[PDB]
Amino acid sequence: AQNPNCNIMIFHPTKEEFNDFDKYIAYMESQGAHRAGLAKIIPPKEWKARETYDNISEILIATPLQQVASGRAGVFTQYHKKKKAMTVGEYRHLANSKKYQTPPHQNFEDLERKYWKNRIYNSPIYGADISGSLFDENTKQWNLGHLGTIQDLLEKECGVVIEGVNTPYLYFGMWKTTFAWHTEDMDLYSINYLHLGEPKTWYVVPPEHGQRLERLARELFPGSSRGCGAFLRHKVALISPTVLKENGIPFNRITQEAGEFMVTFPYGYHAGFNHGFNCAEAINFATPRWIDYGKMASQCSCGEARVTFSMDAFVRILQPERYDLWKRGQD
Ligand SMILES: O=C(O)CNC(=O)C(=O)O
Ligand SMILES: [Mg+2]
Ligand code: NI
Ligand SMILES: [Zn+2]
């Protein structure tokens, strides 16, 4: 068995290997990359996402979210308070202001220590889930707006034609902006490209050990667990690496820098934080190996998780027994 310790693997495809996206994901899995839940892909030196980032300031962040924490430093939840619209240029200036800017630090490990010590005492503002793309239309390799759609994959594997679309999303971050512990909708893959700015640190639990994380989360968040049998779908709970180590939960960590791709694999729980002003683009995708994970994915039916139009068909076709309860949660 390849990668039996479930380490995060880093890949350096050549320009030739960067042509066929599906083929390279299958290659990475042949080497055991999915066992970690997360992989890093460094593009060949010949590749670029677009020519420059000099003209992005007029993009609108219609609903910036202030991420307010409750709990203790290593075990907390966050809620998202809606703020007034602002442009990317306005948001960048805010991220760089004395109130929000990255503190002085020695290296990524010192910054990580400062994040876990001090995150809860601040409320950073995140531009999340903005439909759109920063890939040039002429970029033909690993262009996250030109991937094969999940609806086409389901149709190719299973024969059923379904409604829905699959488009990318932009994220504008600042110091301490935080992504809570989660797997993707329907335990899909994700791919994330860091277009510009400061790094993103990731934490990940191997898919084979995801239920260990869920059992810890039920212990640590006992009211939330009573409320919903899949409350991590709400995307609000944080648990630090120190707490994970104290409870014996297997995990790994890695820092993504600008110009790098990360892939999350089906049922790989992940969480993390941004180091400073940055912009990422991400989208979900599927492969044949996903189908069995989609059929088994948990679902939130309490009303909190509320998701895209296109998840309807995935539930309806892969999980018909759960469909009526889940749809009631959507309504
Ligand atoms: O970058 C972020 O805030 C969160 N991204 C992801 O969870 C992802 O790409 O799957
Ligand atoms: Mg612009
Ligand atoms: Ni994710
Ligand atoms: Zn729920």
The interaxial angle of helices 311-318 and 320-330, nearest 10 deg, is: 150
- Select from 134, 171, 205 the residue to mutate for testing ligand 1; criterion: most ligand atoms less than 8 Å from CB: 171
Q: Is the CB of 273 under 6 A from ligand 1?
A: no
Nearest Cα neighbor of 150 from 182, 189, 183 is 189
Q: What gap in Å lies between CA 313 and CA 255, rounded to an integer? A: 35
Which residues are close to ligand 4, an ion, with C-beta < 5 A? Answer: 228, 300, 302, 304
Q: What gap in Å lies between CA 186 and CA 301, rounded to an integer? A: 13
Q: How far is the CA of 173 from the centre of ligand 2 (A)?
A: 17
Q: Chain centroid to CA 288: how far? A: 21
Q: Are 301 and 222 in contact (CB under 8 A)?
A: no
Q: 21: part of which helix (H) or strand (E)?
A: helix 21-30
The structure's method of determination equals X-ray
Q: How far is the CA of 55 from the centre of ligand 1 (A)?
A: 24
Q: How far is the CA of 159 from the centre of ligand 1 (A)?
A: 30
Phi-psi region of 7 (alpha: psi -120 to 50; beta: other; left: phi over 0): beta
Amino acid at 140: K
Helix, strand, or coil (residue 330): helix
- Is 140 assigned a ligand-binding role in the annotation? no
To which residue do tokens 């593009």 refer? 43
- Is 300 assigned a ligand-binding role in the annotation? yes
Helix, strand, or coil (residue 166): coil
Sorted by sequence, the CB contacts under 8 Å of residue 211 that are 6+ apart come out as none
Q: Are 164 and 309 in contact (CB under 8 A)?
A: yes
Q: Are 240 and 72 in contact (CB under 8 A)?
A: no
HSE (CB half, 13 Å, CA atoms) of 164? 23
Taking the chain, what is the end-to-end CA distance rounded to the nearest angstrom? Answer: 44
Minimum CA distance residue for ligand 1 atom 2: 179
Query: Which domains can be identified in the chain, with CATH numbers?
Result: 1-331 (2.60.120.650)
Minimum CA distance residue for ligand 1 atom 7: 179
| Backbone angles phi and psi of 141, in degrees to 5 | -105, 130
Nearest Cα neighbor of 189 from 37, 77, 5, 322 is 37
To which residue do tokens 């903005």 refer? 130
Sorted by sequence, the CB contacts under 8 Å of residue 35 that are 6+ apart come out as 2, 3, 4, 6, 206, 207, 208
Strand partners, 285: 189
